[PDB]
Design a protein around this ligand. Structure first.
Ligand SMILES: CC(C)(C)NC(=O)[C@@H]1C[C@@H]2CCCC[C@@H]2CN1C[C@@H](O)[C@H](Cc1ccccc1)NC(=O)[C@H](CC(N)=O)NC(=O)c1ccc2ccccc2n1
Lengths: 99, 99
């Protein structure tokens, strides 16, 4: 589809069997989701942004469905105010910026 | 142009007479540049990111050129790990998300 930027780019995503509201983020390397109890092995990690770093748990090859499209990759989970879908997954659903 | 997301979406911008590199960011509402001197009166503001809140200097109605396209709006200057162009300026140059 085509998404304008007047409003925050919120879309519906399906992960771990649940449907969630995530923000499309060209400015995020990784994908960070609100704390949730996922199955699987996970390594500890530190990621930063404006304001500093926060510790998150890293899960690999997690199947995610973004607005109908299907992708699968790394997902960081932690103390975040919103679900951030980063470039790692955006590339997988053929998403681009145009102006 | 059509920018893919296999690599950080960086672009060259021109502002205050200088050139700086900036990350086109759809997940950001505001535009925050690293600490630099800009003409004009400025007001103290605070913004929150993933790592928390930070203090910034706000400049309104400032002209910015993003890959040749002109935009005029608020620009926040503070201690950020990188220069980011937000939705307030991306909308001005008719930028969208596609896939
Ligand atoms: C600029 C401002 C208006 C304050 N907004 C934002 O920061 C909003 C805030 C939202 C609510 C909280 C959760 C994140 C979302 C999305 N972000 C936008 C979002 O695009 C933000 C922009 C950014 C880019 C580079 C450096 C810092 C910050 N990206 C991020 O926060 C991602 C998070 C991640 N680990 O994937 N960080 C990075 O992509 C990133 C890249 C390089 C870095 C180098 C050193 C230190 C930290 C670095 N972080």
């Amino acid at each position: 589809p085509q998404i304008t930027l007047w409003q925050r780019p919120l879309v519906t995503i399906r992960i771990g069997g649940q449907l969630k509201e995530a923000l499309l983020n060209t400015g995020a390397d990784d994908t960070v989701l609100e704390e949730m109890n996922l199955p699987g092995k996970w390594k500890p990690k530190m990621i930063g942004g404006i304001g500093g770093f926060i510790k998150v748990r890293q899960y690999d090859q997690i199947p995610v469905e973004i607005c109908g499209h299907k992708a699968i990759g790394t997902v960081l989970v932690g103390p975040t105010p919103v679900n951030i879908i980063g470039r790692n997954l955006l590339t997988q659903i053929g998403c681009t910026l145009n102006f």
